[PDB]
């Protein structure tokens, strides 16, 4: 017990290493244990990580009578007697420790006073979504780490020089992350009256899989717009057929507009998923308006209008697909 | 120190394909030797104790690598168990509720077959 009780005696966890001297260097490191999918409704995402920290503390310099392997793996519950950098997550809506059998913490104390602390967190980070070109978009969610009670004169973070983020296999439901930019070590926040506070962030990139929407939104909506076109070859005297056949093309499209936006944030700007539905909602309505133009022609050879409309809307609509899918994809 | 541990699951349920997880409460038992608990005072092979004494002995800090949310049960007392055998063998049973997360392959959703796991992992102690 004297390998550790001889160090903590005369040790003060209220005083950082090198109190009036240089700042304390904290080499931040992270292992992503699980990466929850983005919640578009709340603009956040749930992540389970292993936050690692590695600073120097010259009062924890192990004696010369300690062989060890290379470190001094101690009781994880011994963290409460050491100094620890007080870094919070400037994006987290609600974070969480983990004590499932006991509190999940590492504590390595190397021979030269170097210290390693590996918390195990579950963070609900908030990243604003730019839902323009919605199904074919790509977001960038931040994980800003930051000090709170120590200015840059006292505490100072910096990423691991190798691989700071160590994600291995996540495979989100409709996202994916391969390689990104662990940038902005100069992220240091400035707050009026308090000062400069250290910041380091990783901005993941999250491409979206359009597979779910090609068979849940675009596929069924496309056949309904083709369903409206069936009313062109039908005999125009059948008033009770082409009219109900056209009202369906606006009713079902109108229903899909509400059903899709019901599980998304209420952003006030047209997104790519709305340009499609609003366009298809007009091709359906335009076909029904076409019948009114033909019905009036009988009130006086209106088949020419349907003939000119048989091979016009498919051209006027397939022309839309080239313009639409080339812009957003 | 190696710890032979076993599980007794009281109940599954709330297996959510949307949330992609499942809830379960278990009695995580785990046994290890502790040579400085062997005694010659009482002639009893095993010896149950107050779970309040469970906070003064060493305990392996295992976690569930995919637990996704857990909590002890504190209803009316600590739901902890402790019997120190007379050679050092420490038994340790605690009730735990786990909202474990298991990724589901829904390629054949209505009539699929899932395989949800439960990883009991150490955190603060290396393999030696």
């Amino acid at each position: 017990s004297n390998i550790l009780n001889r160090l903590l005696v005369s040790y003060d966890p209220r005083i950082r290493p090198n109190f009036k001297g240089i700042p304390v260097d904290v080499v931040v490191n992270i292992f992503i244990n699980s990466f929850g999918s983005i919640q578009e409704t709340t603009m956040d995402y749930r992540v389970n990580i292993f936050l690692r920290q590695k600073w120097n503390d010259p009062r924890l310099k192990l004696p010369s009578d300690f062989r060890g392997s290379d470190a001094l793996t101690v009781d994880p519950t011994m963290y409460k007697c050491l100094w620890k950098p007080d870094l919070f997550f400037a994006n987290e809506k609600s974070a969480n420790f983990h004590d499932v059998t006991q509190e999940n913490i590492l504590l390595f104390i190397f021979r030269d006073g170097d210290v390693l602390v590996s918390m195990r967190l579950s963070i609900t980070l908030s990243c604003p979504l730019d839902l323009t070109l919605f199904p074919m978009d790509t977001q960038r969610c931040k994980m800003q780490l930051e000090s709170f009670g120590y200015t840059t004169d006292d505490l100072r973070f910096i990423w691991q020089s190798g691989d700071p983020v160590q994600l291995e296999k996540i495979a989100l439901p409709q996202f994916d992350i391969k390689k990104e930019d662990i940038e902005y070590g100069n992220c240091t926040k400035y707050y009026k009256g308090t000062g400069y506070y250290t910041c380091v962030e990783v901005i993941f990139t999250l491409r979206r899989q359009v597979g779910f929407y090609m068979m849940g939104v675009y596929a069924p909506t496309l056949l309904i717009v083709v369903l409206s076109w069936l009313s062109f070859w039908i005999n125009p005297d059948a008033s009770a057929a082409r009219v109900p056949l056209g009202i369906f093309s606006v009713l079902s499209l109108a229903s899909e507009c509400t059903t899709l936006a019901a599980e998304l944030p209420k952003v006030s700007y047209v997104k790519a998923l709305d340009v499609w539905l609003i366009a298809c909602l007009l091709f359906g309505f335009a076909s029904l308006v076409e019948y009114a133009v033909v019905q009036v022609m009988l009130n006086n050879a209106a088949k020419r209008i349907d003939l000119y409309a048989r091979a016009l809307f498919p051209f006027c609509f397939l022309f839309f697909n080239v313009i639409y899918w080339s812009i957003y994809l | 120190v190696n710890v032979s541990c076993n599980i007794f699951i009281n109940s599954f349920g709330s297996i959510a394909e949307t949330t992609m997880d499942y809830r379960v409460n278990i009695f995580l038992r785990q046994q290890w030797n502790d040579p400085r608990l062997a005694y010659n005072e009482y002639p009893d092979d095993s010896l149950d104790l107050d779970p309040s004494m469970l906070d003064s002995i060493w305990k392996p800090d295992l976690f569930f690598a995919n637990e996704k949310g857990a909590h002890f049960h504190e209803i009316t007392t600590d739901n902890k168990l402790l019997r120190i055998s007379r050679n050092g063998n420490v038994l340790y049973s605690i009730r735990i509720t786990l909202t474990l997360a298991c990724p589901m392959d829904l390629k054949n959703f209505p009539m699929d077959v899932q395989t949800c796991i439960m990883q009991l992992e150490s955190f603060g102690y290396t393999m030696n």
Partner: antibody
Amino acid sequence: VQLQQSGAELMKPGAAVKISCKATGHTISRYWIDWLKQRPGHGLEWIGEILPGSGSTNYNEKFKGKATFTAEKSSNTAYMQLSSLTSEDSAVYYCAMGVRGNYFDYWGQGTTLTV
Amino acid sequence: IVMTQSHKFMSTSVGDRVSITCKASQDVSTAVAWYQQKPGQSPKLLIYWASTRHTGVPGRFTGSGSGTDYTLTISSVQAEDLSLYYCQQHYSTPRTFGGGTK
């Protein structure tokens, strides 16, 4: 789990060779890949270790600079590069791997080096 | 740590009991492994933690000892036991082996 190295190597002094360790059976970024040296007349010797996913390495103090560990998840292979080859480097080089401890229970067939 | 085997070559007949001492330098007290390397192949693992066996090893190999002085033991030497035997400490970072016994 298996570790398939490259073939035999023949180099000249001053040059530098890179030995691969093709992990066939598991993702290379999963376990520590250790590197050993067997020089005849003498015994084995531990070069270092590299976790092929996080780029973390713990070289032996005798082989610092002499050896460089790298990885490439495009093919699940861990590399080692020996710089400033000399006649002392004539030996067989292995890429062991210890799963449940700091022992070496998974080995490679070997890669003979002759400076 | 400097693991040492003070017998480079040992003599034994088929069906003998032989002890191979690997006297450690400092106190590891359990961290010892024993390897077997037939000529032209990788050293396969026999014992780890000085008393446990590996998956697929014959039961005639037995590790013992603790602290500094360790020992491998082969109860009934067969014909395949005529090879090199390496001890290995896995207690510290620089993992020396200790030369080898024949």
